Write a protein that binds this ligand. Structure first.
Ligand SMILES: CCCCCCCCCCCCCCCCCC(=O)OC[C@H](COP(=O)([O-])OCC(O)COP(=O)([O-])OC[C@@H](COC(=O)CCCCCCCCCCCCCCCCC)OC(=O)CCCCCCCCCCCCCCCCC)OC(=O)CCCCCCCCCCCCCCCCC
Ligand SMILES: CCCCCCCCCCCCCCCCCC(=O)OC[C@H](COP(=O)(O)OCCN)OC(=O)CCCCCCCCCCCCCCCCC
Ligand SMILES: CCCCCCCCCCCCCCCCCC(=O)OC[C@H](COP(=O)(O)OCCN)OC(=O)CCCCCCCCCCCCCCCCC
Ligand SMILES: CCCCCCCCCCCCO[C@H]1O[C@H](CO)[C@@H](O[C@H]2O[C@@H](CO)[C@H](O)[C@H](O)[C@@H]2O)[C@H](O)[C@H]1O
Lengths: 88, 82, 108, 62, 92, 76
C-alpha cells in the first residue's frame, strides 16, 4: 500500500527545489551539494532557520537545536535527512 | 500507562459494583433478575438508592461519564479497530 | 551578565527563539496563509531588532521574547508520529538480537 | 560422569549419541528427544493422576 | 607445651561447588544504593514534625475514627428483606 | 525543585546524596540516553523518591500550574 522509498538523489532533488523556490538565495546555479548556506547562497542568520524549518516540513521531521545549528552545507542536510528512518 | 489508567479507573467502578452485589445479596437474598425485579417494588427506598448509587458509579466508570472519563481518550493509544 | 550582541551564543539563542516562534505560529494557526503572514511578521520584528548594540536593551528584549513565547505556548503541539512525543514512537521496536545466556547447569 | 555430561551439554550445546552400527559416539546437535528429566516419572505418573482422582472424588462427593 | 591446635587436623577451603554461570545482570550501583537505602530505611528513621504527623494520623486518629464508627454501628443495621415504611435501624 | 515530601527526608539521607529531583518526562527527549525509553544514563544518581519522578510515574502537565488548574476545574 505505502509503496514508497527514499533515496539520496530524491532528497537532493527535493532540497535543491526547496532552495530554488527561496527568494533570499543569491540566485540559482549556486545550489549544489558542496554549497554553503552562509557564504555561497548568501543567507542570513535566520534564513538558515527558515530553510531548516522547510526541511522539517518537507521530510516530516523534527530537528533539535543541537542538530539544527550544525547544518551549514547542503550535503550536510542531505546526510542528515538520509540518517533519519522516518524521513518520509 | 493508558491501559493501566483504563483498568484501574474501571476497578474503581468494579469495587462499587461489588458493594452493590453484597447489598443485593443481603436485602434480596439472591442475585437473580427474576426475584429482584419481582420484589423491588416493596423494598425500602434507601437500600435501593444505595444499590443503584453503587451500580451507577460502576456505570459511571465504564460509560466514561465525567468524574471517571479520563481513560477513554487515553485508550486511543490502542489500534483503531480496538 | 554579558550577552554579547554579535557572538555565537547570541546566534544560537536568537535562532532558537525564531524557531520556537515559527513552530508556535504553525501550531496555533490552522490556515496556511495566515501562518505565512505571521511568520513574515515575526521575521520583520526580528529584523527590526537585529541592529541592537547596547547589551542592556538587548537583555531586556530577550527577556521580552521569552515572556512572549511563554505567553503564546501551545498545549497540544504538532510532532511527527515517529518522533518522541508522537503516536507511533515506540510502537513495534525491533528486538535486540541477543543470544540466550544460561543460568543453570541442568535446566535449558 | 554426571558433571562431565552436563558441563559438556552446557558449554558445547551438544549431547552424545552413539548411532546404531558404528561403535563411536561423539557430541551431536539433535536435541528434539532422547532426553528426559529425573522428576518426570514421579510427578506425571503419581502426582497428576492423584489430583485428577481428587477432582473426581470432589465432584462425586458433591 | 605451646597451646596450639592439633597437627593431625588437615584443613582445606570451603568450596560450594556451584557452576559459575555467565554475567546475566550488569549491576548499576546507583540503583543498588537506592535499593539499600529504601530497604534499610528503618535504621535511619528519626521522629520529626513531618514523621510524627503521619504517625499520629495513621496510628491514633484513623483507628479512633474507624473504632467510633464500628462501635456506634455495632448492631444498628438489619435490612434483610426490609420493606417500605419499615425502619432499617434497630435503635436511635 | 524539591517538594515537601522530598525535603522532609533530609534528616534521614545520611551518607546518601541529596539530589535535586527533576522528572524524566520533562527531560529532553532528543538527547541520547543509555535507556532511551526511561531517559536515564547508567550511573545516574537516583533521588530517594525516584519512584515518583521516573517515566512510569504519573504524568505531569506543564501548560498550567496546578493551583490555577484547580481554579479552572472547580470554576467550570
Ligand atoms: C483444598 C481443596 C483443593 C481442591 C483442588 C481441586 C483439584 C485440583 C485438580 C488439579 C488437576 C491437575 C491435573 C494435572 O496434574 O495435569 C498435569 C499437566 C500439567 O500441564 P503440562 O502441560 O504438562 O505443563 C508443562 C508444559 O506443557 C510443558 O511446556 P510446553 O511446551 O508444553 O508449553 C505450553 C504451555 C505454555 O503456554 C503458556 O505459557 C500459557 C500459560 C498456561 C495457562 C494454562 C491455564 C489453563 C488454561 C485453560 C483455558 C480454558 C479457558 C476456559 O501451555 C500449556 O501447557 C497450556 C495448554 C492449553 C490447553 C491446550 C488446548 C487443548 C484443548 O496437565 C495436563 O496434563 C492436563 C490437565 C487438564 C485438566 C483440566 C480439567 C478440565 C475438566 C474438563 C471440564 C468438563 C468436565 C469437568 C467435570 C469433571 C468430572 C470428573
Ligand atoms: C501511639 C504510638 C506512639 C509511638 C511513640 C514512640 C516514641 C519513641 O519510640 O521514641 C523513641 C525515642 C528516640 O527518638 P529519636 O530521637 O528519633 O532517636 C534517637 C536518635 N536521635 O527514644 C525513647 O523514646 C526512649 C523511650 C524508652 C522508654 C522505656 C520505657 C520502659 C519500658 C519497660
Ligand atoms: C489517598 C488515600 C486514598 C484511600 C482511598 C482510595 C481512593 C482511590 C484510590 C487512589 C489511591 C492512589 C492511587 C495511586 C496509583 C498510581 C499508580 C500508577 O502509577 O498508575 C498511574 C495511572 C495513570 O498513568 P498516567 O500518568 O495517567 O499515563 C497516562 C498516559 N496514558 O493512574 C491510574 O491508573 C489511576 C487509578 C486510580 C483511579 C482513582 C480514581 C478516583 C477518582 C474519583 C472521582 C470522583 C467520582 C465520584 C465518586 C463518588 C463517590 C461517592
Ligand atoms: C502520639 C502518641 C500519643 C497518643 C497515644 C494515644 C494512646 C491512648 C492513650 C489515652 C489513654 C486514655 O484512656 C482513657 O480511657 C479510659 C476508658 O477507655 C478512661 O477511664 C474511663 O474508663 C471506663 C472504662 O472504659 C471507666 O469505667 C470510667 O468510665 C472512666 O471514665 C480513662 O480516663 C483513660 O484511661
Amino acid at each position: 500500500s505505502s509503496a514508497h522509498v527514499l533515496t539520496k538523489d530524491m532528497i537532493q532533488e527535493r532540497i535543491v527545489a526547496l532552495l530554488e523556490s527561496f527568494d533570499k538565495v543569491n540566485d540559482a546555479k549556486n545550489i549544489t551539494a558542496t554549497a554553503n548556506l552562509t557564504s555561497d547562497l548568501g543567507l542570513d542568520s535566520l534564513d538558515v532557520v527558515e530553510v531548516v524549518m522547510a526541511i522539517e516540513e518537507e521530510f516530516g521531521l523534527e530537528i533539535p537545536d543541537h542538530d539544527a545549528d550544525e547544518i551549514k552545507t547542503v550535503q550536510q542536510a542531505i546526510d542528515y535527512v538520509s540518517a533519519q528512518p522516518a524521513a518520509v | 500507562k493508558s491501559a493501566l489508567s483504563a483498568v484501574l479507573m474501571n476497578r474503581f467502578g468494579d469495587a462499587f459494583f461489588v458493594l452493590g452485589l453484597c447489598v443485593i445479596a443481603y436485602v434480596f437474598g439472591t442475585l437473580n433478575y427474576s426475584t429482584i425485579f419481582a420484589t423491588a417494588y416493596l423494598i425500602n427506598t434507601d437500600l435501593l438508592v444505595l444499590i443503584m448509587l453503587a451500580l451507577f458509579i460502576a456505570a459511571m466508570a465504564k460509560s466514561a461519564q465525567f468524574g471517571l472519563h479520563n481513560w477513554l481518550t487515553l485508550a486511543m493509544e490502542g489500534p483503531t479497530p480496538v | 551578565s554579558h550577552p554579547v550582541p554579535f557572538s555565537a551564543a547570541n546566534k544560537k539563542l536568537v535562532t532558537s527563539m525564531y524557531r520556537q516562534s515559527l513552530k508556535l505560529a504553525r501550531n496555533w494557526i490552522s490556515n496556511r496563509q495566515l501562518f505565512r503572514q505571521k511568520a513574515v511578521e515575526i521575521r520583520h520584528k526580528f529584523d527590526q531588532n537585529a541592529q541592537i548594540s547596547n547589551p542592556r536593551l538587548l537583555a531586556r528584549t530577550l527577556d521580552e521574547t521569552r515572556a512572549h513565547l511563554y505567553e503564546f505556548r501551545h498545549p497540544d503541539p504538532i510532532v511527527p508520529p515517529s518522533f518522541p512525543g508522537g503516536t507511533k514512537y515506540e510502537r513495534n521496536v525491533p528486538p535486540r538480537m541477543e543470544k540466550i545466556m544460561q543460568h543453570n547447569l541442568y535446566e535449558p | 560422569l554426571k558433571d562431565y555430561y552436563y558441563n559438556g551439554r552446557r558449554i558445547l550445546d551438544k549431547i552424545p549419541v552413539k548411532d546404531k552400527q558404528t561403535g563411536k559416539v561423539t557430541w551431536e546437535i539433535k536435541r528434539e528427544g532422547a532426553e528426559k528429566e529425573d522428576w518426570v516419572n514421579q510427578m506425571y505418573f503419581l502426582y497428576a493422576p492423584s489430583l485428577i482422582l481428587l477432582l473426581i472424588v470432589m465432584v462425586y462427593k458433591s | 607445651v605451646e597451646l596450639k591446635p592439633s597437627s593431625a587436623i588437615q584443613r582445606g577451603p570451603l568450596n560450594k561447588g556451584g557452576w559459575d554461570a555467565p554475567h546475566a545482570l550488569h549491576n548499576d550501583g546507583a540503583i543498588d544504593r537506592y535499593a539499600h537505602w529504601r530497604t534499610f530505611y528503618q535504621e535511619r528513621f528519626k521522629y520529626t514534625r513531618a514523621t510524627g504527623k503521619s504517625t499520629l494520623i495513621f496510628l491514633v486518629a484513623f483507628p479512633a475514627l474507624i473504632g467510633y464508627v464500628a462501635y456506634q454501628s455495632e448492631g444498628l443495621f438489619e435490612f434483610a428483606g426490609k420493606r417500605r415504611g419499615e425502619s432499617v435501624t434497630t435503635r436511635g | 525543585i524539591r517538594a515537601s515530601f522530598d525535603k522532609a527526608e533530609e534528616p534521614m539521607l545520611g551518607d546518601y546524596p541529596d539530589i535535586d529531583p527533576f522528572p524524566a518526562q520533562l527531560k529532553n527527549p532528543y538527547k541520547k540516553y543509555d535507556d532511551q525509553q526511561d531517559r536515564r544514563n547508567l550511573e545516574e544518581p537516583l533521588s530517594v523518591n525516584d519512584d515518583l519522578y521516573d517515566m512510569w510515574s504519573p504524568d505531569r502537565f506543564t501548560h498550567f500550574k496546578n493551583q490555577d488548574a484547580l481554579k479552572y476545574f472547580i470554576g467550570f
